[PDB]
Amino acid sequence: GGPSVFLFPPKPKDTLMISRTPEVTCVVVDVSHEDPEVKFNWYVDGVEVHNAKTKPREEQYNSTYRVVSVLTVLHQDWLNGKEYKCKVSNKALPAPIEKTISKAKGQPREPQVYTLPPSREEMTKNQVSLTCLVKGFYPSDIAVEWESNGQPENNYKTTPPVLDSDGSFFLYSKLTVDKSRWQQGNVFSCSVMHEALHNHYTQKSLSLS
Amino acid sequence: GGPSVFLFPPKPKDTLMISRTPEVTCVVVDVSHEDPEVKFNWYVDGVEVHNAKTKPREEQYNSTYRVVSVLTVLHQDWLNGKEYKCKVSNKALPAPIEKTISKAKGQPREPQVYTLPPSREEMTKNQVSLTCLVKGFYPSDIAVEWESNGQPENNYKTTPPVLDSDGSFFLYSKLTVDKSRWQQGNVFSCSVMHEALHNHYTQKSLSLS
Ligand SMILES: *[C@@H]1O[C@H](CO[C@@H]2O[C@@H](C)[C@@H](O)[C@@H](O)[C@@H]2O)[C@@H](O[C@@H]2O[C@H](CO)[C@@H](O[C@@H]3O[C@H](CO[C@H]4O[C@H](CO)[C@@H](O)[C@H](O)[C@@H]4O[C@@H]4O[C@H](CO)[C@@H](O[C@@H]5O[C@H](CO)[C@H](O)[C@H](O)[C@H]5O)[C@H](O)[C@H]4NC(C)=O)[C@@H](O)[C@H](O[C@H]4O[C@H](CO)[C@@H](O)[C@H](O)[C@@H]4O[C@@H]4O[C@H](CO)[C@@H](O)[C@H](O)[C@H]4NC(C)=O)[C@@H]3O)[C@H](O)[C@H]2NC(C)=O)[C@H](O)[C@H]1NC(C)=O
Numbered sequence: 080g081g082p083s084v085f086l087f088p089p090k091p092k093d094t095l096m097i098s099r100t101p102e103v104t105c106v107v108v109d110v111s112h113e114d115p116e117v118k119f120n121w122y123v124d125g126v127e128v129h130n131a132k133t134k135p136r137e138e139q140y141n142s143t144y145r146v147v148s149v150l151t152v153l154h155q156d157w158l159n160g161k162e163y164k165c166k167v168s169n170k171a172l173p174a175p176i177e178k179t180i181s182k183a184k185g186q187p188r189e190p191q192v193y194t195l196p197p198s199r200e201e202m203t204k205n206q207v208s209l210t211c212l213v214k215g216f217y218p219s220d221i222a223v224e225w226e227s228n229g230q231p232e233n234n235y236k237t238t239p240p241v242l243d244s245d246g247s248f249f250l251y252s253k254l255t256v257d258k259s260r261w262q263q264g265n266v267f268s269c270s271v272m273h274e275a276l277h278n279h280y281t282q283k284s285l286s287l288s
Numbered sequence: 289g290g291p292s293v294f295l296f297p298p299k300p301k302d303t304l305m306i307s308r309t310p311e312v313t314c315v316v317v318d319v320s321h322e323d324p325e326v327k328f329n330w331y332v333d334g335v336e337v338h339n340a341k342t343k344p345r346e347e348q349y350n351s352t353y354r355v356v357s358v359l360t361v362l363h364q365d366w367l368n369g370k371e372y373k374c375k376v377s378n379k380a381l382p383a384p385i386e387k388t389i390s391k392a393k394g395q396p397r398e399p400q401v402y403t404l405p406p407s408r409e410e411m412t413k414n415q416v417s418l419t420c421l422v423k424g425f426y427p428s429d430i431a432v433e434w435e436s437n438g439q440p441e442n443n444y445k446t447t448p449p450v451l452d453s454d455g456s457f458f459l460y461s462k463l464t465v466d467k468s469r470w471q472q473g474n475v476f477s478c479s480v481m482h483e484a485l486h487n488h489y490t491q492k493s494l495s496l497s
């Protein structure tokens with residue numbers, strides 16, 4: 080086992096907002112001292128591209144090198160399902176290692192977003208759970224956040240996406256708030272970003288009624 | 289190179305029900321045709337034990353073999369946190385490989401179980417989502433099922449456990465039913481099995497209210 084290669088996608092948010100900078104990152108670890116030269120070749124749908132930004136090798140504490148190449152992707156290319164190939168050549172290798180990444184193949188499907196209030200039986204407790212259910216989406220690349228009054232609500236966790244029986248995905252996000260904030264009629268909102276949403280955004284709010 | 293070893297815990301349900309048979313599983317992959325024969329030794333807190341069963345092997349489509357030992361464990365041994373060690377010996381591998389596993393450590397904490405009805409917004413669809421929020425539990429080993437009129441309801445998916453900010457875990461389980469069944473006022477219940485519950489079991493009901 081000479082070097083190993085890991086190829087990382089853009090963050091889901093980066094491909095959905097034109098203001099952001101989506102990237103694919105090709106990382107090569109366990110490059111030896113005896114064969115330290117690394118060459119990257121990058122292909123987009125199998126055609127070679129020359130605009131990647133490759134950093135100089137960095138020696139790790141375990142006396143091997145780590146080398147990183149970063150390819151900027153166009154938002155619409157990623158969303159049109161183009162395939163990104165990183166080919167890594169090194170003299171310790173019997174053959175160059177190739178890795179490919181893309182958005183998961185399939186027709187995109189819009190997330191249905193539903194907000195659910197706390198159970199009345201949780202209403203004895205000091206802190207209470209506000210739920211956002213996001214279902215029927217494809218592919219599973221998605222981002223979820225909570226706000227109240229224009230401001231990020233930081234006490235939330237989101238489940239990974241889960242493959243549903245019809246082939247789409249779902250998840251839940253849980254915001255935890257002090258009981259009293261919920262009593263006071265505060266409006267909380269769950270926001271979702273996904274390629275199949277109009278403007279890649281929807282928001283759903285939830286309040287005591 | 290040679291074979292490599294992966295050691296797997298019992299299913300949560302199996303350890304919590306005395307009628308069930310919990311098993312620790314030692315899976316050996318990359319076993320070649322040229323070097324075929326694998327030995328297993330098994331240990332429970334260092335004391336060698338002798339109850340253990342090798343499965344008939346599988347030929348993988350990469351032309352390597354997949355060999356499996358299965359050790360039956362006592363429910364209370366697993367729950368009291370005893371260590372299970374799998375020592376794999378293959379004389380075309382530099383030395384014997386040992387792997388060890390046990391229950392996650394720390395004070396078990398009781399799950400809080402809340403059922404949530406479908407969103408008002410969801411009530412215009414043909415199928416609706418019944419939600420069971422299970423939070424505050426430790427360790428993350430748990431089982432969740434659904435029933436109606438003492439009969440299993442099978443069209444559900446449960447998220448993996450998620451680490452909450454207090455070091456406990458939560459998850460959600462989603463049952464999908466025909467809106468018809470829901471509107472007619474059928475009772476549905478979410479069953480939860482976890483070591484910290486009395487009798488390792490609780491159920492919460494959900495009907496049109
Ligand atoms: C020598 O040391 C080096 C360096 O390590 C460092 O130094 C040593 C001495 C120690 O101090 C050590 O602690 C230090 O870290 C060792 O190098 C490591 O080698 C291992 C393998 O041996 C690598 O393991 C893989 O890791 C992947 C995840 O890596 C990320 O997350 C970890 C922590 O969780 C980080 O440490 C990494 O840096 C990676 O972090 C990610 O980096 C991306 C690129 O920068 C980020 O994306 C970019 O981020 C920016 C902003 O941040 C933008 O957003 C960009 O647009 C964006 O692209 C990303 O944000 C960041 N994430 C996080 C969370 O930080 C694992 O994915 C991978 O698992 C796969 O492979 C396994 C087999 O190898 C397999 O078992 C797994 O199942 C998994 O398989 C994949 O599964 C999916 C399906 O689910 C499939 O899609 C894939 O096909 C499939 N892949 C397969 C089959 O290959 C590995 O575990 C490790 O990353 C690496 N470290 C570093 C730092 O590079 C080296 O091992 C040592 N050597 C020896 C001999 O000791």
Ligand SMILES: *[C@@H]1O[C@H](CO[C@@H]2O[C@@H](C)[C@@H](O)[C@@H](O)[C@@H]2O)[C@@H](O[C@@H]2O[C@H](CO)[C@@H](O[C@@H]3O[C@H](CO[C@H]4O[C@H](CO)[C@@H](O)[C@H](O)[C@@H]4O[C@@H]4O[C@H](CO)[C@@H](O)[C@H](O)[C@H]4NC(C)=O)[C@@H](O)[C@H](O[C@H]4O[C@H](CO)[C@@H](O)[C@H](O)[C@@H]4O[C@@H]4O[C@H](CO)[C@@H](O)[C@H](O)[C@H]4NC(C)=O)[C@@H]3O)[C@H](O)[C@H]2NC(C)=O)[C@H](O)[C@H]1NC(C)=O
Pocket residue numbers: 294296297313315317318348349350352354
């Ligand atoms: C030749 O073929 C075989 C088999 O081929 C495979 O299957 C067939 C049918 C085809 O579809 C193929 O396309 C497919 O490739 C290959 O053998 C595979 O080899 C890899 C390693 O190279 C193994 O990966 C490990 O997997 C375990 C988890 O595996 C479970 O889940 C899999 C589904 O995701 C499932 O396939 C497995 O069978 C297994 O399933 C469980 O099995 C038990 C008993 O049957 C059962 O009770 C469970 O219910 C069941 N569970 C589920 C969910 O299904 C994974 O844990 C390993 O990850 C660790 O190690 C990695 C390094 O390899 C590392 O990157 C990870 O981070 C992780 O590391 C650990 O992390 C923990 C926790 O964080 C930490 O404490 C530790 O420090 C750390 N430990 C270590 C040791 O590092 C790992 O990924 C495959 O299981 C295996 N496939 C099968 C079917 O057995 C073989 O590679 C091929 N060979 C060649 C040369 O090509």
